[PDB]
Design a protein around this nucleic acid. Structure first.
Length: 86
RNA sequence: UUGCAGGGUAUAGACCCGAAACCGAGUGAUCUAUCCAUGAGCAGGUUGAAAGUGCCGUAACAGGCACCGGAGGACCGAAC
């Protein structure tokens, strides 16, 4: 998984405001970290379809938040995807 | 009966010539069959597999496109 410590590290890096932990930036960053970490699990467990269902839902949620953020403020979206390599 | 001569017969090549064979011991792989070692040859012209690289793409594999590469009891065709 991701520990509480590195989850809070990601939160702190992408804080738009003080202890917000809810903006599209921090949400997308946390989803990105979780997906990139779960890649390790699914390389060793290819037939884990029940877990892959949740990972696909993570991908879908990140895509929804990225499109919403792009439609809201395009500078923030172009900055966020550049930071996250998307 | 013993010689000598003659006719026949017996055993021997047994009137002469003639097999395809069978057996024994050698000679041959400078032809040819396969193999072993060690050398040599295959003008010229084609096609364009895998791999690779880049860009895109994918959550990631996947996938696409271009370039590139030079496979093959591959193709056309002399020597052979």
């Amino acid at each position: 998984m991701l520990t509480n410590s590195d989850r809070e590290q990601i939160i702190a890096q992408y804080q738009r405001g003080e202890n917000d932990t809810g903006s599209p930036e921090v949400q997308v960053a946390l989803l990105s970290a979780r997906i990139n970490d779960l890649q390790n699990h699914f390389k060793a467990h290819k037939a884990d379809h029940h877990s892959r269902r949740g990972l696909i839902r993570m991908v879908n949620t990140r895509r929804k938040l990225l499109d919403y953020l792009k439609g809201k403020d395009l500078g923030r979206y172009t900055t966020l995807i550049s930071q996250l390599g998307l």
